[PDB]
Symmetry: C3
Subunit: 274 residues, 3 copies
């Protein structure tokens, strides 16, 4: 699976040399195998692409005088920023992620675990939000690591009944969840991958919320457990957004219609009854 | 006291070389001095025991075609994983921990602070769960780091009132808490070491739960603060489980009883 | 803006060589350029100031025999610790922070973002507490990173509506929040920078609490969202504390009056 950095280095390296700003790691070396690289000393964006290893390597770079001429993504990137935004679609462990969407390591691990089908565009997920699935709940044991003691036949028995379990432990026998576009998810939020298949477009998940069921489009959910406090817009307004899908507009189209995006009232007058 | 890695190496190294997968740190080099170690390049389990420094290094190692012949614990381990599961009973800062039981740094720190008496077998604690004790609440101040300014005279009367406080600030004057076997603790959960002395066997603690009270065996508790939602099993089943104690079974009898472990109804017909 | 380390070295280094304990990073090498430094081998507090890079490095250092003659802050410090306590008033991204006050990376970021005006003395903030502001809620979109696509003119009208917004998205058009002295903030707590301007002196914010409005002095708030459960003291006691301000006492005054700090009744009798 290509990392975020590999996907960008593909796009933008264009025959340049990779300049590693920071102490390299094993994961970074494996990612830099197809490319030629050296430690960063003097760097010129015309000959070098700067890879900061950690986020603290990046702010050291950005506080250096040579960062003056480097553009984000085009000329530099952070390796330890797998959830960082990009202005184009990318793949996070083969999970599609739309433009201008970012998240933290709890969501990265969820993509790796297969819990996520897709993440949409213009979606903002706090770095401490978490997504996990339930263990089996209708067996004599609740442990998962006990399966490290199962031989092949016991494991087979065990896997057979996990797949028939209608509560979807470890997200078995359910569709991976789709996180919509223009979604907001707050700090320390939790989403149960065993019971959630959908976070609708425009949904807001407040800080500390424990999400155990699907979140309808443009609903605001808070609490432990999370419940709908309100919707961002009227039911007539939501139907309109889901039809227009401004999050699919081009960059040109976004700027030319910024008004309708800044003013929900004007959006409704223009696109409601067309 | 001995770190998790040292207990594993003493048991499984078997005269091999330690092959370090990742950038070695000061703490790792100190723990590796009694042994022979080198940076990992080409490794074979007949001659090398692979130690991944960070969990980032481990996933890179498991991505290497060389890792296929390496079995967990017996042939490789992560150093930045003091709470990671082991197939044998271990110690975590003088705290007994059962087989196939894992937890995060929040719980490792709790063992180091003396908050935990023991942790059972086959217990699953999410990495973000926290265990902490309360600051003092019967004083003019709640700060703890103000004591960095206390001389020994002030330190003495401060320590004095703490240990008499019936609300057990910093878990003073109370027994450390036992965490049972087959326990599940969810993400961002919190357990108050001032007020909790037992998490019973089989208890489930939900994500985001704030646990201020002992949790009975096989109770499911959720919420802020945590309340008992339901129990996993009937009363008679719970008694049977507390008598049978399948979590003390050997590896073979766990496999022999996989049908009873999978189906609670078959468990009762057999053992009830 | 000076890092925490820079502020400590300026105050305590006193012509000694900086001895680096751990793998040095790019950020650290830059911070150490105005000073003479080398990798730590053998160290003597008479001639060396030890800088541990990570908290892991510091654990190794304090377990080494060479450390037992070293005093915290005066002779050693961790570089990976901008939220760590200091015995003197410091700045964190030009936010004033009182003595013996500590917090985690979530609060360091809030200082960097401009969400915090000041943090008082002897205040204890758990490492998993978080402080953030709201996105705009009066527009068709909630995203913030859409503005990366806004051309020059679209950016202008976007920022103009942000500034006139009474719910203060991104903490616009509001005062940064003041966190008081003798404050306690628990694990996984959250404070909303868009609606909160004051955490009063002596306030207690429980574990898991979601704080959406101002916390009065010496109030105890818990829950999701946080609600006032009780106050630490009587109203007249609270007014006396806010007038006396023991948290600004000198070190000598704290030790001389330790019995009043340990006994609330003695405090009220002496200062009420
Ligand atoms: C992408 C990133 O990195 S995000 C960075 C970190 N930022 C955050 O976590 C911000 C989280 N924001 C929130 O939680 C906000 O409250 C949001 C998104 C729900 C917006 O709140 P707004 O509605 O202003 O809140 P306002 O108080 O009107 O809300 C009204 C009701 O919702 C409740 N509410 C709001 N948030 C929560 C919450 N997180 N938990 C419980 N209740 C909440 C309020 O208490 C209030 O209840 P009351 O009138 O019902 O008694
Ligand atoms: C060690 C690790 O691997 S941790 C990995 C990280 N994973 C997690 O943290 C997931 C944690 N999981 C949980 O918290 C689960 O939801 C568990 C185990 C309690 C689930 O219990 P279940 O039996 O599925 O409950 P089921 O969904 O029917 O719902 C029961 C009730 O509990 C509520 N509930 C479930 N979990 C929570 C929770 N975490 N907080 C509040 N309420 C909860 C449900 O809303 C429902 O309420 P109701 O019955 O009042 O309507
Ligand atoms: C760096 C650090 O700060 S270390 C962090 C690790 N430790 C923590 O975060 C522990 C934080 N401490 C707490 O949460 C404590 O409960 C405190 C200090 C906030 C208050 O505890 P106390 O004053 O002893 O309250 P005591 O348990 O009687 O409970 C009083 C009421 O508050 C409620 N309560 C206590 N804690 C919480 C909580 N965390 N969340 C919601 N309610 C709570 C109790 O349920 C009780 O309710 P009741 O009146 O209905 O019975």
């Amino acid at each position: 699976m290509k990392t975020r950095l590999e996907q960008v280095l593909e796009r933008y390296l264009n025959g340049r040399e990779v300049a590693v700003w920071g102490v390299p790691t094993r994961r970074l070396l494996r990612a830099l195998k197809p490319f030629k690289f050296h430690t960063a000393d003097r760097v010129d964006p015309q000959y070098h692409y700067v890879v900061a290893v950690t986020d603290d390597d990046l702010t050291d770079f950005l506080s250096d005088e040579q960062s003056k001429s480097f553009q984000y993504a085009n000329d530099y990137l952070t390796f330890d920023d797998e959830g960082g935004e990009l202005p184009f679609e990318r793949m996070c462990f083969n999970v599609p992620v739309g433009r201008q969407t970012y998240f933290g390591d709890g969501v990265v691990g969820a993509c790796e675990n297969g819990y996520i089908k897709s993440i949409g565009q213009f979606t903002s997920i706090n770095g401490t939000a978490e997504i996990h699935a339930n263990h089996q709940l209708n067996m004599t044991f609740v442990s998962d690591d006990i399966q490290n003691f199962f031989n092949e036949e016991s494991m087979a028995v065990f896997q057979e009944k996990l797949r028939k379990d209608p509560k979807h432990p470890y997200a078995y026998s359910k569709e991976p969840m789709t996180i919509g576009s223009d979604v907001y998810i707050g700090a320390h939020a939790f989403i149960n991958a065993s019971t959630v298949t959908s976070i609708g477009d425009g949904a807001i998940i407040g800080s500390g919320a424990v999400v155990l069921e699907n979140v309808p489009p443009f609903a605001v959910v808070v609490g432990v457990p999370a419940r709908i406090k309100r919707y961002r817009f009227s039911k007539e307004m939501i139907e309109t957004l889901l039809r227009v899908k401004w999050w699919d507009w081009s960059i040109e189209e976004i700027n030319e219609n910024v008004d309708a995006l800044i003013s929900p009232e004007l959006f409704m007058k223009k696109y409601g009854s067309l």
